[PDB]
Amino acid sequence: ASAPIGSAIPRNNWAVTCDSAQSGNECNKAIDGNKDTFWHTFYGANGDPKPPHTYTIDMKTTQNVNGLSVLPRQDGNQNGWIGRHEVYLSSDGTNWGSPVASGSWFADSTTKYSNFETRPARYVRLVAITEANGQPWTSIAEINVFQASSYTAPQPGLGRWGPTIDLPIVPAAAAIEPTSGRVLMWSSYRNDAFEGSPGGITLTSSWDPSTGIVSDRTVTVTKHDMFCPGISMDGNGQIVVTGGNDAKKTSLYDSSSDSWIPGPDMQVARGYQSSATMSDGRVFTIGGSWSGGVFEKNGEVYSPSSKTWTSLPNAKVNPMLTADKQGLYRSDNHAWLFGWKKGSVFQAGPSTAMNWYYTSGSGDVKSAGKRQSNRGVAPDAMCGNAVMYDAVKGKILTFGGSPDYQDSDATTNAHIITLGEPGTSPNTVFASNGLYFARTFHTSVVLPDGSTFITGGQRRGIPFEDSTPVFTPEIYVPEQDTFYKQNPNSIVRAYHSISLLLPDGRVFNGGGGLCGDCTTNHFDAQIFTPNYLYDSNGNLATRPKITRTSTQSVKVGGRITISTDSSISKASLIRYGTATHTVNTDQRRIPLTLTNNGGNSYSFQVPSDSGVALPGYWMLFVMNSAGVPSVASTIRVTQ
């Protein structure tokens, strides 16, 4: 099932009202504690008024509300399930503001939850915008509201969490659809379970930041259950999703047509491998013993032009293996891969040993030294994160993780790796004094200003369990070499969580769980709004506008000229992201050197090396003197 983040508020003295209710199915039957009695809107002789339908609770006194739950009818009747919905809170019962949560619940009779940041409130309203299968009615057997143990206002200047997006699946994998700006998400053959899959099916869901609409879709055309896969956006602008529950399959997601297309089978069956887009737009992958067998799985490379996978048996996985106690099943998982110059791929971890991978001929691998600092040699950091926040200077920030995949203490370890040419050993140093909070299974994104946002995880890695959670996110600021705690959230985001940068500059953070009949499935996501979007008074700041671009598609080395509605101080290109199991090999950031043409007209060059400016879709952000970013303009980079 799932679970709330607080404890149920006693309903003895509640007063409730509904937009309509059938005799015998009164509004208060939803709060009588009897699973066999239910509220039901008008039907039969009363006519069949269509949704939206509304349930409003007066709890009589202020509670620190952090969620609600809906128990559907228990008599096998399926016609009142709530689909699209919104949750509002109020202190007077008349002014409701914006929803604290909204989205879509899956069509079944399981208990449904909305979990969200604690907010003091006396009144609670649930709006059923649609019935789950489009019928006229709404029904509820039991509704509950949950409270936190306490409430603390967010600190000024440290960002803001909310709202919650309620989903019909657990989003354990996700990507931005660059042409549409939507968030694409998927689970497995079921909405919350991968176990005992017959393969050939993936449940997907998308969220549109511009409309708030959650959609869903069942993908069978690629004959691929895409749980536990490699993910890369290739040079042809298609997301290459590899292996996992169907360990040899390749699926291609095309943003332009919003459709899935069969790809060629991989040469080697894999799960939990990392893949990385290359300087020439191809995709390299290596490792992955979660599925398809446990043995040495060396590299292979996908060509979008010839639609083939080709084995690179001499791109040896052996040098990048961690010393995981469980052995090869884990030790070749989730490599920290970055496409780099001349078809090379850098492997930054999680193993202590870093390596250069090469893709010419039958492949090759060369030692790049140990991840280390004056504090010592860095231990294996399975499910730590790695983020290329300045591709032009070859800067990679790595942090967190634990020596073993599970039942292992996470660390605060963090490093800056500075890449030069392939085949050279990069300089590595410790990053500041490391993380505030040791964490593994955390996720991260590079932000427009070059800072890295770090969120979720737990201190001791225990998949499917929400123990030792870390609720306080951190931001690394390179020019100060300092980490900063941000405002905390209240939903655990550990194993099977994801984070992505949205085109509007906010962070989308979600998932966790995906373990069938477990209590730790999170059918939701939350928005984090960074401090750079707020003015000194905590109101949303005015953002600069890009009013023109000379072109929206550019070859590496090419220039773009833009016009803005105000003066801008900085700009950056950020490659669109993909995420699962802590891995995001697609995001990276290029700080742009601007030429000022005067009159708020500016130009810049895209770097000429496609190992730096990896082909694909990028976000162009400009920032004013106050540090406020524009929303992204989408740029296609070609090689």
37 binds Ca ion (CB under 5 A): yes
> Is residue 303 within 8 Å of residue 310, measured between CB atoms?
yes
Neighbours of 497 (CB within 10 A): 30
Minimum CB separation of residue 142 from Ca ion in Å reads 5
Using alpha carbons only, give the angle 526, 527, 528 rounded to the nearest 5 degrees.
120
Residue with Cβ nearer Ca ion (25 or 468): 25
Tell whether 113 is in a known binding site: no
Residue with Cβ nearer Ca ion (16 or 203): 16
Query: In the chain, how long is the greatest CA-to-CA distance?
Result: 80
Q: Who's near 38: CB < 8 A, 6+ residues apart?
A: 25, 29, 30, 73, 80, 139, 140, 141
Tell whether 534 is in a known binding site: no
Tell whether 581 is in a known binding site: yes
Q: Interface with Ca ion by CB under 5 A: which range of 133-141, 174-182, 413-421, 504-512?
A: 133-141
Minimum CB separation of residue 168 from Ca ion in Å reads 24
Neighbours of 151 (CB within 10 A): 15
Minimum CB separation of residue 38 from Ca ion in Å reads 6
Write the interaction track for Ca ion spanning residues 150-189; mark x where CB under 5 A is met and - where it is not. ----------------------------------------
Q: Please identify which residue in 34, 155, 259, 425 interacts with Ca ion, judged by CB under 5 A.
A: 34
Minimum CB separation of residue 109 from Ca ion in Å reads 14
Q: What is the DSSP string of 62-101?
A: EEEEEEEEEE--SSS--TT-B-EEEEEEESSSS---S-SE
Site size with Ca ion, rule: CB under 5 A: 6
Residue with Cβ nearer Ca ion (143 or 321): 143
Q: Interface with Ca ion by CB under 5 A: which range of 28-36, 91-99, 371-379, 436-444?
A: 28-36
Minimum CB separation of residue 24 from Ca ion in Å reads 12
Tell whether 496 is in a known binding site: yes
> Is residue 111 within 8 Å of residue 70, measured between CB atoms?
yes
Distances in whole angstroms, Cα of residue 507 to Cα of each of 256, 288, 431, 501: 23, 28, 23, 5
Residue with Cβ nearer Ca ion (37 or 251): 37
Among residues 55, 302, 495, 534, which one is catalytic?
495
Residue with Cβ nearer Ca ion (23 or 433): 23
> Is residue 315 within 8 Å of residue 347, measured between CB atoms?
no
Residue with Cβ nearer Ca ion (20 or 251): 20
Residue 75 Rama label (left phi>0; alpha psi -120 to 50; beta): alpha
Query: Whose CA is closest to 505, among 479, 474, 473, 527?
Result: 527
Note the residue count of the chain: 639
Residue with tokens 């604690």: 118
Whole-number CA gyration radius for the chain: 25
Minimum CB separation of residue 69 from Ca ion in Å reads 13
| Near Ca ion in 135-154, by CB under 5 A | 141-142
Q: Interface with Ca ion by CB under 5 A: which range of 30-38, 106-114, 171-179, 602-610?
A: 30-38
Active site residue 329: no
Query: Whose CA is closest to 626, among 577, 568, 587?
Result: 568
Q: Interface with Ca ion by CB under 5 A: which range of 35-43, 226-234, 415-423, 456-464?
A: 35-43
How far apart, in whole angstroms, are the C-alpha atoms of residue 194 and residue 184? 18
Minimum CB separation of residue 35 from Ca ion in Å reads 6
Residue with Cβ nearer Ca ion (37 or 291): 37
Q: Interface with Ca ion by CB under 5 A: which range of 32-40, 74-82, 472-480, 565-573?
A: 32-40
Residue with tokens 């649930």: 126
Residue with smallest beta-carbon separation from Ca ion: 37
Query: Whose CA is closest to 383, among 437, 331, 445, 317?
Result: 331
Q: Residues comprising the binding site?
A: 272, 495-496, 581
Q: Which residues are identified as catalytic?
A: 495
List interacting residues with Ca ion (CB under 5 A): 29, 32, 34, 37, 141-142
Q: Residues comprising the binding site for Cu cation?
A: 272, 495-496, 581
